[PDB]
Amino acid sequence: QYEAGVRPYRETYYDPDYEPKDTDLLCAFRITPKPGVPMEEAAAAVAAESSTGTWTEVWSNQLTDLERYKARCYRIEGDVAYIAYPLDLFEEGSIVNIMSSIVGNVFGFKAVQALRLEDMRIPVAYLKTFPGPPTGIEVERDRLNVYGRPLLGGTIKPKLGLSAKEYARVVYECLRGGLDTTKDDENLNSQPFNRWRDRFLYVMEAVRKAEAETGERKGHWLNVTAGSTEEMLKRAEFAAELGSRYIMVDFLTAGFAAFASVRRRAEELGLMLHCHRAMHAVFDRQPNHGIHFRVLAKWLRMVGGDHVHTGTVVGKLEGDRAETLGIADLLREDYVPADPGRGLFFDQDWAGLKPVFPVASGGIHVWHVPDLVSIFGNDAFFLFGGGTHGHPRGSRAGATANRVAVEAVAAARTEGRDILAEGREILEEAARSCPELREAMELWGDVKFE
Amino acid sequence: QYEAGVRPYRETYYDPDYEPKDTDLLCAFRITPKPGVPMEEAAAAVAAESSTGTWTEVWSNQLTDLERYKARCYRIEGDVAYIAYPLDLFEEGSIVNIMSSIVGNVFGFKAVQALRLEDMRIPVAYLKTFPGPPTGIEVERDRLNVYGRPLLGGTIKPKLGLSAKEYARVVYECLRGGLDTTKDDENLNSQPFNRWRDRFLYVMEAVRKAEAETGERKGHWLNVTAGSTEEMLKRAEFAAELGSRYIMVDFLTAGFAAFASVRRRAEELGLMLHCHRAMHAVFDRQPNHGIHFRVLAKWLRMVGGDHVHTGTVVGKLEGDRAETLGIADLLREDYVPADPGRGLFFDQDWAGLKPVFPVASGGIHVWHVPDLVSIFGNDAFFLFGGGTHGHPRGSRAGATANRVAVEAVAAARTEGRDILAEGREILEEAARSCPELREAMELWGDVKFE
Amino acid sequence: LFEEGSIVNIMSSIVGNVFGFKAVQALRLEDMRIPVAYLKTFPGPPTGIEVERDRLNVYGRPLLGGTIKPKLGLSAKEYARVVYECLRGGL
Ligand SMILES: O=C(O)[C@@](O)(COP(=O)(O)O)[C@H](O)[C@H](O)COP(=O)(O)O
Ligand SMILES: O=C(O)[C@@](O)(COP(=O)(O)O)[C@H](O)[C@H](O)COP(=O)(O)O
Ligand SMILES: [Mg+2]
Ligand SMILES: [Mg+2]
């Protein structure tokens, strides 16, 4: 039955009658066809060229049962195509393989001028081949002995240029002042002005000093991001040898294959793994083309990060409130039902994988705390970089202002108060008893991001 | 001199009088500011948040000489911003670090609604920290014993679903019929229907069988892409054990850190490394946002791929001719001068690094050969997947057709003939002696992409 | 011309054979300009002045040292007795 020649993709790969199986992997693509290409043919091309098909009929199609393996577009709602992929198409436990199919080539076809992967339904049968986070929210709270509030953090600034000595000095001032954690900037790895061995040594010394002086458990997210998997693992081992509770990795710039290796070793070493999403905005910013972050967040939890940045909504970087509320649920809950209002196109069963800590960071200061607590609740990290070191009196006073603000708003929420309506009043009440908080509120009162 | 508060980014990070140094890393960004944000401020924000700055002044800025480490926008032409980065900002030999700075966070700022990295000037002093390709064009031509023509390849189809036995049957027919090489699809890793150990074994038996019957050297690009670096290295080692000349990696989905690890091991194993750019169109397609592929090509050559896909221009996937000509030079030449007509914003000295084979693949057939040879010349791989297996008489016949087409056009060019004006005649000439070629021309004569 | 990160290669070229030619009866290498692009292939000191001063907690003065004498002949026990006296005394 081999009939050589080109045929429309929709002949074989558009099936509006197909009923998805619980074992199918489902994708929701927002397709902008080339003018003149019908939506059905465009969605069939995506399905075909992300599973089994190519641009012309091949004699070798007779050597297998394509009906058993082909992906199928089974539903179209406007410019949104739903595609189902049989379980057997994917390599167990490999996000890399998911990407190679779902986003490998289908974004560059002339027939599809724009394409955005909006969401993906990971079947339970496939999730069971992934380990998920190595620590999880509950275990991490026990390790830090911190309950009932968000956790305080902050990126050391300037991003680059500080010696290891001056760098650990800022770390010490922050942790001493009330921050639970501090972190290397995503782009601080090992550079002539600040070599990783020096920084790890100096910083862990500052961590122990602040922990001893405050009586509270502290940590620093030592960035092991490096140019090769071997180098990253070497730095994770040094971090563990020094007694660090945490390491940090840029999981998108380093990449998913190496990220899996680091997550494996982090658990073996007893380290908690903070995951920075550097580069994500290259893929997930534009609504017409790319990969939505909620998909990257799912992949992140599947491989197993202990934290991942989720945006602030109200900070210097872009983030939608509704979509962020849905992403927090994808990271923390056992089961997330579909919700069009939040861009959740599918129900997501997490098959018992551990939850991930959301991390809100980027251009936030005290006045944002009511919003942040309203969005995330207690199970999140709030990071104040400039919002800490930019305090009129320096990092220690800035850390105190942010710690007090967060504890005051978290307490108000637990008391049943409306922290958005009474946000200002909650902060002013705490400011009367805290000069550092007052000075911070005066400094950045006029600083806002739409 | 520390004054707390928010300051304009351009006060420190915009310097239109700065003169770039030969040791500076230079970026060309096409910026779409948030409406109302001046171009100078947007460009300065990109510079500040990709180097040393943040959203508010910090007391710790006094602890280092930011003038020595800060990036600076030194030139703006309309919506293109040129930014210079001092050499000391970057970790030696780490593309991962380059990305963490240059594309880490600056694509997700509210103040910059779209941003595209158009080009990057890698300084010689930083290039000398990278190994480049392990094999290179010249050494590879010696290993295959092929000179004076493009090399023939082809992806096995259907992408997925073939058993290892049937998969190697298609491979043998292609190689027996005239293809120099065949390759696993980017998304074929190890799956229930086709496990990698089986495929590697079956395929290498087919490769040896075709090499003995043809008397020409053959290869198959065995995909080691996997969910972790360790697993990829394990599959590379098995490919070498079997005597394969090649392995293949999806260097963007696997990621740059694991890419470096596989490149290191490939050289140690004596393997040639084909690199598939799966996922590139997610962020190199749209002209308003992302990273142009020419930047990805430079990074690819620095880490050290032996080939990388470059597009076909005339095939099923999008690609501009002028931009592809420049990228081909970037992959193959020792020095590439700037050229506005091709989007080459900077001169690029390659500091003696070995060159990379361009690979043209995707929806091409015999009628495209005149264009392909005209674009790329002899130093390139042309891959015919569907264009081989879709032949009316099967893969071996298709391979003969494509092989005869490429050799006839390559011969015409070496004779001085204008292969674009006489492209059709050159192919009809060969068709009169090659029924396989004639059959292929009739089948796909009416199949064109814009 | 030079292998990255190899002082050994520098010497093999610059001072390998050219000091023993009949045509050049004496030759002295007075200085050498190491270009930045070649320097970036070398790691440099592992500690450095500043880090080392932090490890010893000594600032604002030269540091004191001293070779144990006699050069050779001291037992390990007596050798460490001299060391202790020196360090105890201010070195
Ligand atoms: O480099 C930066 O900008 C930060 O250190 C913030 O510093 P400030 O706290 O001084 O703003 C974080 O990496 C970003 O917030 C990441 O953005 P996201 O969390 O969206 O990935
Ligand atoms: O998956 C595919 O479509 C291919 O196997 C082509 O199959 P055909 O040869 O049957 O078209 C290649 O991976 C693409 O050409 C890659 O695109 P690029 O080279 O632009 O990365
Ligand atoms: Mg940062
Ligand atoms: Mg392919």
Side-chain angles (χ1 to χ4, degrees):
Chain A
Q1 250 176 341
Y2 170 50
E3 200 174 84
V6 173
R7 314 191 65 90
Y9 287 108
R10 70 169 292 168
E11 169 190 88
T12 299
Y13 296 95
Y14 178 57
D15 189 0
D17 297 322
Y18 179 81
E19 206 73 53
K21 301 176 178 63
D22 295 354
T23 54
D24 290 339
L25 194 152
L26 315 178
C27 294
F29 285 96
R30 194 172 298 276
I31 305 181
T32 304
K34 173 165 143 59
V37 177
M39 187 64 56
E40 292 86 351
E41 180 63 22
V46 173
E49 295 272 1
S50 60
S51 58
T52 57
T54 182
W55 68 279
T56 196
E57 191 64 46
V58 298
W59 73 279
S60 42
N61 284 338
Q62 312 168 119
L63 305 181
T64 188
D65 187 5
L66 277 186
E67 222 71 2
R68 163 175 193 184
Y69 298 110
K70 71 181 187 185
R72 317 176 185 206
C73 174
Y74 63 89
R75 174 189 170 194
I76 298 173
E77 303 298 347
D79 60 0
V80 176
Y82 294 80
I83 308 180
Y85 298 71
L87 179 62
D88 279 12
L89 284 187
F90 303 93
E91 169 162 0
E92 296 85 346
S94 177
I95 294 301
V96 174
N97 178 254
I98 298 172
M99 303 185 286
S100 301
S101 281
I102 307 304
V103 306
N105 301 335
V106 292
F107 287 74
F109 280 73
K110 293 175 178 174
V112 177
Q113 280 176 356
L115 180 67
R116 201 200 194 187
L117 176 59
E118 303 285 21
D119 199 354
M120 177 182 296
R121 198 286 295 276
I122 315 296
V124 172
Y126 193 53
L127 272 179
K128 293 296 296 185
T129 70
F130 292 81
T135 314
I137 288 176
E138 174 187 336
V139 175
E140 174 161 11
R141 286 197 172 280
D142 292 333
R143 293 197 183 181
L144 287 185
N145 197 47
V146 171
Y147 310 95
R149 61 165 175 88
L151 299 108
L152 277 290
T155 308
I156 303 304
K157 305 293 178 180
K159 311 170 64 68
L160 301 172
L162 289 179
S163 65
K165 188 186 192 180
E166 297 302 331
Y167 186 93
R169 179 150 90 93
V170 183
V171 172
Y172 169 72
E173 294 305 303
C174 294
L175 301 176
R176 184 65 177 76
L179 297 195
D180 298 296
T181 61
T182 44
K183 66 182 289 296
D184 300 338
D185 239 307
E186 70 289 321
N187 63 344
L188 177 55
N189 303 345
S190 192
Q191 286 110 314
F193 51 84
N194 185 310
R195 294 299 185 190
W196 70 273
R197 286 185 184 276
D198 290 329
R199 184 170 74 258
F200 288 29
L201 278 162
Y202 276 88
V203 163
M204 285 311 310
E205 179 171 297
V207 172
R208 299 184 205 106
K209 196 166 188 285
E211 179 161 335
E213 290 178 13
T214 64
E216 303 183 286
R217 300 182 187 178
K218 312 290 193 178
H220 184 93
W221 302 346
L222 295 162
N223 199 349
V224 303
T225 299
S228 69
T229 308
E230 292 80 7
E231 185 62 25
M232 293 204 284
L233 298 176
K234 188 201 298 182
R235 301 181 186 184
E237 312 235 53
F238 197 57
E241 173 182 352
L242 297 178
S244 181
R245 292 190 177 89
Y246 294 97
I247 53 168
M248 155 185 181
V249 69
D250 306 346
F251 70 101
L252 295 175
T253 52
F256 266 102
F259 172 38
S261 305
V262 171
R263 173 261 178 270
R264 188 205 98 263
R265 193 82 188 108
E267 184 179 24
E268 292 169 353
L269 293 176
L271 298 163
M272 294 187 277
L273 184 53
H274 173 74
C275 301
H276 186 291
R277 60 176 186 171
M279 195 172 195
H280 77 97
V282 173
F283 325 133
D284 74 14
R285 182 64 185 275
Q286 304 301 328
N288 63 321
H289 187 90
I291 302 165
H292 198 282
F293 181 68
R294 72 174 59 90
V295 172
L296 306 169
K298 289 188 180 191
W299 297 345
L300 179 284
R301 185 172 180 187
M302 291 169 61
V303 176
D306 286 326
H307 326 149
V308 67
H309 292 231
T310 53
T312 66
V313 181
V314 302
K316 72 191 185 181
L317 299 118
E318 189 59 68
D320 182 69
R321 190 176 298 251
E323 296 191 329
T324 302
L325 286 172
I327 289 167
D329 282 359
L330 291 173
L331 290 170
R332 300 186 304 205
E333 305 299 325
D334 301 336
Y335 184 95
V336 180
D339 187 338
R342 296 178 175 179
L344 300 170
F345 291 76
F346 309 102
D347 306 322
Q348 187 56 70
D349 189 338
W350 277 110
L353 272 61
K354 281 176 169 183
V356 178
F357 256 116
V359 180
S361 181
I364 53 171
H365 50 77
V366 284
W367 288 103
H368 295 126
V369 173
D371 277 298
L372 299 164
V373 173
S374 169
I375 293 169
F376 296 102
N378 291 327
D379 284 350
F381 278 84
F382 301 163
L383 307 196
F384 301 89
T388 295
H389 328 299
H391 193 275
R393 296 208 257 104
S395 283
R396 192 194 281 203
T400 295
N402 294 317
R403 174 65 177 277
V404 173
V406 168
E407 284 181 340
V409 172
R413 189 184 84 105
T414 303
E415 294 164 14
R417 303 181 63 180
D418 185 324
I419 58 173
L420 286 184
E422 303 182 308
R424 181 186 203 88
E425 289 66 71
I426 289 165
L427 294 167
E428 297 282 17
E429 289 167 22
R432 284 199 295 97
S433 301
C434 195
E436 293 84 358
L437 176 55
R438 192 184 318 115
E439 298 176 331
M441 293 173 66
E442 298 168 1
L443 179 64
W444 293 302
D446 280 75
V447 183
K448 313 178 174 184
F449 311 90
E450 289 194 75
Chain B
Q1 239 178 358
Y2 169 53
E3 197 201 334
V6 174
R7 305 213 59 81
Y9 282 114
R10 74 164 284 169
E11 182 173 290
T12 291
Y13 296 92
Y14 178 59
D15 178 8
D17 302 319
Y18 179 78
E19 205 68 58
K21 307 172 174 65
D22 291 355
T23 54
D24 286 342
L25 192 148
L26 310 181
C27 290
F29 283 106
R30 191 170 302 273
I31 305 189
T32 297
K34 170 171 147 60
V37 177
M39 185 60 63
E40 296 84 353
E41 182 64 8
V46 174
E49 294 278 353
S50 60
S51 63
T52 60
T54 181
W55 67 277
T56 189
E57 190 70 21
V58 294
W59 76 276
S60 41
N61 283 344
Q62 315 164 111
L63 303 180
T64 192
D65 185 1
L66 281 180
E67 219 70 2
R68 159 176 194 184
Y69 296 114
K70 77 185 181 179
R72 330 177 178 204
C73 178
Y74 62 94
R75 179 185 167 196
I76 300 178
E77 303 281 8
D79 59 358
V80 172
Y82 297 76
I83 306 179
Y85 296 76
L87 181 66
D88 285 9
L89 285 187
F90 301 97
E91 177 166 357
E92 297 83 350
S94 172
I95 294 301
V96 172
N97 179 254
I98 297 176
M99 297 184 300
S100 299
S101 280
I102 306 307
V103 305
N105 300 331
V106 291
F107 288 73
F109 276 75
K110 292 177 172 168
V112 175
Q113 289 182 343
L115 182 71
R116 197 199 201 191
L117 179 59
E118 303 283 20
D119 196 2
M120 179 186 294
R121 200 285 295 281
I122 313 293
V124 171
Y126 192 50
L127 270 182
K128 293 296 295 187
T129 66
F130 296 80
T135 317
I137 288 176
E138 291 303 326
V139 175
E140 173 162 7
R141 283 197 173 273
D142 289 347
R143 294 190 179 178
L144 297 178
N145 199 42
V146 177
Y147 312 89
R149 64 163 174 91
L151 297 109
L152 277 284
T155 307
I156 303 301
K157 303 293 175 184
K159 309 170 63 66
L160 305 174
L162 289 180
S163 69
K165 187 184 189 181
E166 299 293 357
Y167 191 92
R169 176 145 80 98
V170 184
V171 167
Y172 169 75
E173 292 297 305
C174 294
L175 300 179
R176 183 66 176 80
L179 297 193
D180 300 299
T181 64
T182 47
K183 69 181 285 296
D184 291 348
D185 240 313
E186 68 286 322
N187 65 341
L188 175 61
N189 303 348
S190 188
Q191 283 108 320
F193 53 83
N194 187 310
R195 295 298 180 191
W196 69 272
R197 279 186 191 279
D198 294 331
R199 178 167 79 264
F200 285 32
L201 281 156
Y202 278 91
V203 165
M204 287 311 305
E205 178 178 56
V207 174
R208 299 180 210 115
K209 195 164 185 282
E211 179 161 330
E213 295 184 2
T214 62
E216 299 180 295
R217 298 182 185 178
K218 303 293 188 184
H220 184 90
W221 303 344
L222 294 164
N223 201 350
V224 299
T225 298
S228 74
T229 312
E230 293 83 3
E231 184 66 28
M232 292 200 287
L233 301 173
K234 184 201 299 182
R235 299 181 184 183
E237 308 253 19
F238 193 64
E241 177 178 338
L242 297 180
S244 179
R245 293 190 173 90
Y246 291 101
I247 54 165
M248 144 184 187
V249 69
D250 311 351
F251 72 105
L252 292 178
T253 56
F256 267 101
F259 177 25
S261 295
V262 168
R263 177 260 176 258
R264 185 203 100 261
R265 191 78 191 109
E267 183 179 49
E268 294 170 351
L269 295 173
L271 298 162
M272 294 186 279
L273 183 59
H274 172 77
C275 298
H276 187 281
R277 58 177 186 172
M279 199 182 189
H280 75 105
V282 167
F283 54 94
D284 80 0
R285 175 101 185 255
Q286 304 301 341
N288 65 325
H289 189 86
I291 302 164
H292 200 278
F293 180 74
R294 71 174 62 86
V295 175
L296 304 178
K298 293 189 177 186
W299 298 345
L300 180 282
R301 184 170 180 180
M302 293 161 61
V303 176
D306 285 322
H307 332 144
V308 69
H309 291 232
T310 54
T312 67
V313 181
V314 300
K316 75 190 175 187
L317 298 138
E318 187 56 73
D320 177 76
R321 187 177 299 252
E323 299 187 329
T324 301
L325 289 169
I327 291 161
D329 283 357
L330 290 176
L331 291 173
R332 301 189 304 201
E333 305 299 321
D334 301 336
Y335 187 93
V336 177
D339 183 355
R342 300 178 173 180
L344 297 176
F345 291 76
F346 310 100
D347 306 312
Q348 188 59 66
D349 189 334
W350 276 111
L353 269 59
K354 288 170 165 183
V356 178
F357 260 116
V359 183
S361 178
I364 48 169
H365 48 74
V366 288
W367 289 99
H368 293 125
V369 173
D371 277 302
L372 294 170
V373 177
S374 175
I375 292 171
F376 293 103
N378 285 335
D379 287 349
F381 278 85
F382 304 157
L383 313 190
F384 301 88
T388 295
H389 324 300
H391 192 276
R393 297 190 180 276
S395 300
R396 189 195 290 204
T400 294
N402 297 319
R403 176 65 178 271
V404 170
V406 169
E407 291 198 338
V409 175
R413 190 182 83 111
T414 306
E415 293 170 13
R417 307 181 58 183
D418 176 8
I419 55 171
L420 280 178
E422 305 180 273
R424 180 189 203 85
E425 290 63 66
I426 292 165
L427 289 169
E428 296 286 15
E429 284 171 42
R432 290 198 296 275
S433 47
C434 191
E436 293 84 4
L437 179 60
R438 188 197 65 248
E439 291 178 280
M441 293 169 64
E442 296 180 3
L443 182 62
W444 294 301
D446 297 302
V447 184
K448 167 173 173 174
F449 315 84
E450 288 190 41
Chain C
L1 285 187
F2 301 97
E3 177 166 357
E4 297 83 350
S6 172
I7 294 301
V8 172
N9 179 254
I10 297 176
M11 297 184 300
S12 299
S13 280
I14 306 307
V15 305
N17 300 331
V18 291
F19 288 73
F21 276 75
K22 292 177 172 168
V24 175
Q25 289 182 343
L27 182 71
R28 197 199 201 191
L29 179 59
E30 303 283 20
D31 196 2
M32 179 186 294
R33 200 285 295 281
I34 313 293
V36 171
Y38 192 50
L39 270 182
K40 293 296 295 187
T41 66
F42 296 80
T47 317
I49 288 176
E50 291 303 326
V51 175
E52 173 162 7
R53 283 197 173 273
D54 289 347
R55 294 190 179 178
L56 297 178
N57 199 42
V58 177
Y59 312 89
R61 64 163 174 91
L63 297 109
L64 277 284
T67 307
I68 303 301
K69 303 293 175 184
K71 309 170 63 66
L72 305 174
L74 289 180
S75 69
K77 187 184 189 181
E78 299 293 357
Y79 191 92
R81 176 145 80 98
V82 184
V83 167
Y84 169 75
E85 292 297 305
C86 294
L87 300 179
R88 183 66 176 80
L91 297 193

